Amino acid sequence: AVPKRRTSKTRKNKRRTHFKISVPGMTECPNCGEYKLSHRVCKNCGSY
Amino acid sequence: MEAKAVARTIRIAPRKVRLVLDLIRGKNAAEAIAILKLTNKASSPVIEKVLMSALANAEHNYDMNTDELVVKEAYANEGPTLKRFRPRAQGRASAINKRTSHITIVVSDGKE
Amino acid sequence: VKRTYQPNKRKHSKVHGFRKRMSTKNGRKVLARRRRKGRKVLS
Amino acid sequence: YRKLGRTSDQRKAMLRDLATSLIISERIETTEARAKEVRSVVEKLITLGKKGDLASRRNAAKTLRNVEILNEDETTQTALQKLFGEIAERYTERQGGYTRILKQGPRRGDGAESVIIELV
RNA sequence: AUGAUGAGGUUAAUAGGUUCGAGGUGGAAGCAUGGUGACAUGUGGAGCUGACGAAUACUAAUCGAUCGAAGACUUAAU
RNA sequence: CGCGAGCUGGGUUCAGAACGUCGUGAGACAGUUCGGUCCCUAUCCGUCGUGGGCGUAGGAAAUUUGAGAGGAGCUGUCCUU
RNA sequence: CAAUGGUAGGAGAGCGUUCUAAGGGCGUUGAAGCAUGAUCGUAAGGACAUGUGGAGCGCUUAGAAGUGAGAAUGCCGGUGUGAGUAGCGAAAGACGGGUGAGAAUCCCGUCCACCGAUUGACUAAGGUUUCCAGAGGAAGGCUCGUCCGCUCUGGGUUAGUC
RNA sequence: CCGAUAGUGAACCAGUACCGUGAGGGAAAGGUGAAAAGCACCCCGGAAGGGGAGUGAAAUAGAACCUGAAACCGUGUGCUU
RNA sequence: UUAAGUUAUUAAGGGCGCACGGUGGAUGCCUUGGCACUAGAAGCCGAUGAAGGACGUUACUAACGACGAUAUGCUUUGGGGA
Ligand SMILES: CC[C@H]1OC(=O)[C@H](C)[C@@H](OC(=O)NCCCOCCC#Cc2ccc3c(=O)c(C(=O)O)cn(C)c3c2)[C@H](C)[C@@H](O[C@@H]2O[C@H](C)C[C@H](N(C)C)[C@H]2O)[C@](C)(OC)C[C@@H](C)C(=O)[C@H](C)[C@H]2NC(=O)O[C@@]21C
Numbered sequence: 170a171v172p173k174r175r176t177s178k179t180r181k182n183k184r185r186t187h188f189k190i191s192v193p194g195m196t197e198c199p200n201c202g203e204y205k206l207s208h209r210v211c212k213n214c215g216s217y
Numbered sequence: 218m219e220a221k222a223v224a225r226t227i228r229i230a231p232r233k234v235r236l237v238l239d240l241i242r243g244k245n246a247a248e249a250i251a252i253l254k255l256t257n258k259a260s261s262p263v264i265e266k267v268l269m270s271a272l273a274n275a276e277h278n279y280d281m282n283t284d285e286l287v288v289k290e291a292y293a294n295e296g297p298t299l300k301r302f303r304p305r306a307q308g309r310a311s312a313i314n315k316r317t318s319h320i321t322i323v324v325s326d327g328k329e
Numbered sequence: 330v331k332r333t334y335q336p337n338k339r340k341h342s343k344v345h346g347f348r349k350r351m352s353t354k355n356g357r358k359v360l361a362r363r364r365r366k367g368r369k370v371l372s
Numbered sequence: 373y374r375k376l377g378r379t380s381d382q383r384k385a386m387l388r389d390l391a392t393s394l395i396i397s398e399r400i401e402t403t404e405a406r407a408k409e410v411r412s413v414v415e416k417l418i419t420l421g422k423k424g425d426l427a428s429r430r431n432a433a434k435t436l437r438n439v440e441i442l443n444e445d446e447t448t449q450t451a452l453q454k455l456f457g458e459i460a461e462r463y464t465e466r467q468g469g470y471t472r473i474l475k476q477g478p479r480r481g482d483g484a485e486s487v488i489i490e491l492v
Numbered sequence: 493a494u495g496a497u498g499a500g501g502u503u504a505a506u507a508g509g510u511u512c513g514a515g516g517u518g519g520a521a522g523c524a525u526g527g528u529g530a531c532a533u534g535u536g537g538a539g540c541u542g543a544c545g546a547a548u549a550c551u552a553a554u555c556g557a558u559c560g561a562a563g564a565c566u567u568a569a570u
Numbered sequence: 571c572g573c574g575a576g577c578u579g580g581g582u583u584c585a586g587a588a589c590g591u592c593g594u595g596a597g598a599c600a601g602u603u604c605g606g607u608c609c610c611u612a613u614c615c616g617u618c619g620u621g622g623g624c625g626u627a628g629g630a631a632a633u634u635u636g637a638g639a640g641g642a643g644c645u646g647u648c649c650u651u
Numbered sequence: 652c653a654a655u656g657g658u659a660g661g662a663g664a665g666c667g668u669u670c671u672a673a674g675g676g677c678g679u680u681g682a683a684g685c686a687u688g689a690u691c692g693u694a695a696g697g698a699c700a701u702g703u704g705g706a707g708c709g710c711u712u713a714g715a716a717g718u719g720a721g722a723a724u725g726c727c728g729g730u731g732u733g734a735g736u737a738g739c740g741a742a743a744g745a746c747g748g749g750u751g752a753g754a755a756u757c758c759c760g761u762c763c764a765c766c767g768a769u770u771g772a773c774u775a776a777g778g779u780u781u782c783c784a785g786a787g788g789a790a791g792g793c794u795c796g797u798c799c800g801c802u803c804u805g806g807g808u809u810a811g812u813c
Numbered sequence: 814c815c816g817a818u819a820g821u822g823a824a825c826c827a828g829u830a831c832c833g834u835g836a837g838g839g840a841a842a843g844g845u846g847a848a849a850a851g852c853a854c855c856c857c858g859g860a861a862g863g864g865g866a867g868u869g870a871a872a873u874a875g876a877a878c879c880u881g882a883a884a885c886c887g888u889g890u891g892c893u894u
Numbered sequence: 895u896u897a898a899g900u901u902a903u904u905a906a907g908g909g910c911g912c913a914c915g916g917u918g919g920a921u922g923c924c925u926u927g928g929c930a931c932u933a934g935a936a937g938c939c940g941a942u943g944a945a946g947g948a949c950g951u952u953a954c955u956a957a958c959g960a961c962g963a964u965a966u967g968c969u970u971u972g973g974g975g976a
Pocket residue numbers: 584608609
């Protein structure tokens with residue numbers, strides 16, 4: 170139950186290929202033109 | 218041509234800051250700001266401020282207006298780590314490395 | 330669990346302490362070595 | 373239905389307390405899961421209020437907490453009285469709804485999707 | 493497990509609520525009668541009812557964004 | 571004498587004790603007897619499921635043949651002739 | 652013309668590092684180090700050019716040695732991997748208002764919940780300033796933090812009878 | 814003879830942090846520049862930081878400050894898969 | 895056009911070269927401090943209170959030296975020089 174050997178830099182960088190953050194679901198707000206998250210209330214204006 | 222802005226010894230481990238910077242690489246200034254302000258991560262407020270400084274730097278020092286700016290390249294690299302310990306079981310102590318980050322952002326007009 | 334060193338100022342200063350080391354010649358010794366060593370807390 | 377990461381007694385209590393507070397304030401801020409679960413409870417209480425017969429009053433007394441509101445001109449009346457005298461009239465003609473929900477961005481301390489549940 | 497799969501996004505029954513029902517429980521509350529009381533009887537298979545069936549846009553799936561073809565040579569028939 | 575980083579720990583093989591025997595004695599016996607701490611967050615190969623990328627000379631929605639592969643594969647009694 | 656695999660091992664010739672003696676030299680017109688390069692000798696290794704670098708250092712002959720590291724479960728110091736994984740240390744919180752650059756986490760309020768031969772009140776031993784009021788947020792708080800047993804400033808313990 | 818893993822344990826408020834009930838044990842830590850000339854003002858930020866301007870021969874000499882190697886971590890890409 | 899055959903492209907990521915950064919404190923140069931000695935002094939301090947300490951002492955104030963309630967020092971004789 171211990172690592173029998175090192176994980177080389179190649180293996181490391183390989184495993185984390187799919188480890189990333191997604192760009193937010195952002196759309197432009199119709200009253201102010203600033204971006205907002207879709208289905209959420211704009212925090213700059215306060216609309217829909 | 219190129220505006221610079223750097224934040225040093227920020228108290229966030231570099232693996233964690235780089236996850237957010239892998240999004241604003243090569244995007245426009247407005248879109249970049251909208252990403253940061255809406256991405257719900259810890260490093261995001263501290264980067265939105267390094268970007269802000271660069272852009273201000275651009276306007277106040279080069280007359281580089283912000284409507285045409287793109288994060289030419291933006292990265293983060295290790296900083297002066299702070300070493301601490303956690304009292305674990307059976308008298309043994311394990312280490313905790315509180316890391317830091319040297320955030321850099323450069324925005325360009327794409328021109329010469 | 331009851332561990333060791335249940336502190337007590339009186340016994341600490343009785344078993345140890347300047348006047349106790351000054352009561353026996355061997356007590357006088359440890360002060361001698363501690364001054365040769367340049368120690369700051371002698372007893 | 374949902375469990376809200378909590379036991380039965382602690383949830384029963386949280387749901388009824390959150391419903392009472394909503395009735396007091398007419399719009400509150402909370403996380404999605406609990407808004408989605410207080411929606412039904414508050415909607416059903418308002419139904420118990422659209423009839424106003426003593427049976428429904430006594431039965432709605434089960435859920436609401438006993439609180440006092442100081443209205444304008446230092447007028448005082450409790451949650452039951454509000455439900456049956458100021459909210460029954462407002463929704464006498466509407467046959468559902470009674471509540472809306474407006475998603476908001478994630479909070480800082482967690483990644484919880486805060487929302488505002490308001491009486492419509 | 494997450495992601496996938498599948499049913500739906502207003503030109504909408506996808507989920508919540510409302511209305512009706514199935515199933516479950518078993519005679520709600522308030523009255524009136526009788527009893528000293530503990531209680532009982534009629535109203536009234538009443539009242540309540542999480543996931544189950546149906547109808548209804550009342551509430552939320554409003555706004556928007558991203559990705560995604562223009563089709564290689566060679567030879568044989570055509 | 572498959573399998574304890576899957577399990578138990580009764581036997582056996584630590585320290586306690588006791589009986590029979592041997593030894594002057596400390597102790598001893600594969601002679602009995604009662605008691606006696608079973609640790610580990612899985613890196614790789616392997617295996618059971620479950621995603622993403624790319625290739626199948628255009629981009630797609632659906633229906634597919636089957637090269638292979640896997641699973642089953644047991645049997646009783648009674649009656650009739 | 653003949654010989655030249657080689658371990659324990661014997662023999663010989665040498666390359667390098669510091670210092671010393673003498674001789675002869677190089678150096679802000681840029682020394683030693685450091686980095687790069689497609690250069691030279693049979694090897695240990697030696698130069699040259701270009702960058703960084705901002706003062707010492709080569710060469711010849713000869714002398715002396717703390718003189719050459721890859722392994723000792725070596726010592727010291729840095730940095731990895733396991734991995735964004737395990738863990739986040741017994742428990743009930745919800746919501747309105749306020750404060751701020753920022754709030755599940757700080758202040759106020761309502762409701763709810765837990766203890767109650769005690770998580771309550773005293774007083775010893777022990778610790779010594781953790782006590783109080785302002786202010787701050789690097790660090791310490793297993794998260795956050797505008798908060799604190801944290802930091803800065805200024806304060807606070809009064810006996811003839813205890 | 815040694816030049817900061819050396820030379821005293823100690824070049825630096827060292828027999829001191831610290832550890833132990835106590836005898837006792839016992840560290841780690843030098844170098845901005847010639848001169849402090851130690852960065853007036855402006856800009857983003859609550860601040861830490863930074864980016865200009867200025868000081869200086871030099872500021873990848875800006876106080877953790879001479880040179881600044883390797884492990885290690887990144888950002889580009891020429892050729893590959 | 896259709897049949898048969900052949901071959902790109904791809905890069906989520908990886909490799910190798912190269913460039914530019916960080917981290918870190920090797921190396922080089924440096925000396926405040928050590929080490930081994932030589933030559934000459936000297937080789938007793940205490941009830942006249944020692945050696946070693948503890949408290950104090952400054953305009954303000956913690957630490958280190960110095961000092962002792964005459965305290966961050968006093969007197970005197972000489973040296974010197976803002
Ligand atoms: C809790 C964590 C710790 O783990 C452990 O204790 C586990 C439980 C232990 O498992 C075992 O007992 N065997 C499996 C059970 C075997 O039953 C048969 C009946 C018996 C017996 C016996 C015989 C003689 C003596 C003895 O003569 C004597 C004395 O006093 O002289 C003391 N007794 C007790 C004896 C008892 C580990 C794993 C043990 O290893 C094993 O031992 C053997 C020597 C060999 C095993 N293999 C090679 C075949 C080996 O695998 C060790 C020695 O532990 C004592 C592990 C060592 C490394 C440790 O020290 C670690 C740090 C532990 N210490 C601690 O704190 O964490 C531990 C991990």
